[PDB]
Amino acid sequence: GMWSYDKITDYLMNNLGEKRYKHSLGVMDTAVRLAGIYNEDTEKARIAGLVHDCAKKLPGEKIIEICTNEGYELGDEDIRNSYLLHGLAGRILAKKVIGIDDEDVLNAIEFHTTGRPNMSLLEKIIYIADYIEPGREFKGVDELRKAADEDLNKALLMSFDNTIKFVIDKGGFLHHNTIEARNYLISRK
Amino acid sequence: GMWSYDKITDYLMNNLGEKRYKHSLGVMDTAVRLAGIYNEDTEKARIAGLVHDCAKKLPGEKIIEICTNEGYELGDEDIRNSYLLHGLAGRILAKKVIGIDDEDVLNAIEFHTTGRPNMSLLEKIIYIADYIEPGREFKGVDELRKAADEDLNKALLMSFDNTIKFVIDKGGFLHHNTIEARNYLISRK
Ligand SMILES: [Fe+3]
Ligand SMILES: [Fe+3]
Ligand SMILES: [Fe+3]
Ligand SMILES: [Fe+3]
Numbered sequence: 413g414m415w416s417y418d419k420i421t422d423y424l425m426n427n428l429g430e431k432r433y434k435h436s437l438g439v440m441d442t443a444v445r446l447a448g449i450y451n452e453d454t455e456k457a458r459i460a461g462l463v464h465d466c467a468k469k470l471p472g473e474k475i476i477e478i479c480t481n482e483g484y485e486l487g488d489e490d491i492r493n494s495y496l497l498h499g500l501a502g503r504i505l506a507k508k509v510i511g512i513d514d515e516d517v518l519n520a521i522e523f524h525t526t527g528r529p530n531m532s533l534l535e536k537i538i539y540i541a542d543y544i545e546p547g548r549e550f551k552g553v554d555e556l557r558k559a560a561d562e563d564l565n566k567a568l569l570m571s572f573d574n575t576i577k578f579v580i581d582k583g584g585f586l587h588h589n590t591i592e593a594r595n596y597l598i599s600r601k
Numbered sequence: 602g603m604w605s606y607d608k609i610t611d612y613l614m615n616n617l618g619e620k621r622y623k624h625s626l627g628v629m630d631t632a633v634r635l636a637g638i639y640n641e642d643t644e645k646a647r648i649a650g651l652v653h654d655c656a657k658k659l660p661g662e663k664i665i666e667i668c669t670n671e672g673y674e675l676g677d678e679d680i681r682n683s684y685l686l687h688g689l690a691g692r693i694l695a696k697k698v699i700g701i702d703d704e705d706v707l708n709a710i711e712f713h714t715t716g717r718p719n720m721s722l723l724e725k726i727i728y729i730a731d732y733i734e735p736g737r738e739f740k741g742v743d744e745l746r747k748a749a750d751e752d753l754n755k756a757l758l759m760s761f762d763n764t765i766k767f768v769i770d771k772g773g774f775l776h777h778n779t780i781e782a783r784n785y786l787i788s789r790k
Contacts (some may be wrong), residue, residue, distance in 0.1 A: 489784070586780050599774070
């Protein structure tokens with residue numbers, strides 16, 4: 413069955429450490445706030461936000477092993493940036509360890525690192541909450557916060573654009589889910 | 602059989618018009634020059650460069666119809682930027698109308714608009730020649746020309762980066778082949 417809130421918080425503090433656990437509470441609170449604005453279920457928002465980073469502190473090799481063992485097919489393109497995953501590994505832990513069965517919550521956890529095409533409202537909220545939670549501080553966090561409060565799709569687009577430019581600037585790999593997520597928003601806009 | 606050079610030039614002038622035909626001769630000459638630098642076959646370079654834009658002046662709807670009729674499966678992601686495709690339609694015309702059978706030449710024509718992972722030397726030469734042919738003039742064309750003369754992979758990477766940033770800036774769609782082409786170069790670098 414599903415773990416109690418208190419059992420979950422114990423598990424997250426143990427696995428994530430103080431700083432990342434505090435981040436997670438911030439994401440939770442932010443997800444709940446956005447849920448209020450957009451009429452999303454508050455408890456779906458609270459649980460997905462709370463547990464979204466449950467696999468964050470695992471080594472990439474272990475993340476890959478968890479995903480592979482549970483039946484997910486990963487390609488070389490998924491393995492080469494193993495950081496990214498922690499969303500899928502987190503979905504797996506949320507389902508198999510924590511006992512969370514809600515499909516929307518599991519998707520929101522899975523795709524929070526990259527986004528994807530045709531995201532649910534909950535998926536969007538969890539994705540953006542990670543960027544705008546109160547504990548975050550970076551150039552432009554404010555416009556992003558404003559946009560999230562008014563026009564969620566705009567906020568995601570702004571985030572995707574920033575990510576892609578940053579990766580280009582750093583010479584890193586670009587994940588297809590992020591590219592496809594952005595295209596999908598442009599085509600609906 | 603394959604058309605004579607003179608028949609090809611007649612066809613290109615008629616179909617492309619003066620300005621775009623002149624561009625094509627520039628690409629041809631540039632491809633030949635780069636072929637000399639990199640030890641690629643000069644006649645493969647000359648024909649691919651000459652005919653690469655043979656389908657450029659067709660309407661997008663007709664480009665799509667040519668590709669579909671000849672058996673290529675196009676997705677919504679291919680159709681939404683139909684401009685791009687003219688490479689595949691050009692490959693089809695080069696094979697079925699002009700009588701060009703060389704697989705490498707056909708690939709170089711097909712992928713000149715986007716690039717792709719694991720390009721041949723000829724594919725790379727045709728792709729970059731389009732950007733650096735003498736008739737071109739834009740911010741940074743010079744560094745691109747320098748890089749092409751010394752480090753072809755560097756030049757492509759620079760081009761892909763520029764394209765992606767430009768599309769983001771303009772709010773357009775990003776084609777998976779360009780993203781995948783860039784990732785492939787980063788992973789070999
Ligand atoms: Fe995360
Ligand atoms: Fe996070
Ligand atoms: Fe072209
Ligand atoms: Fe061209």
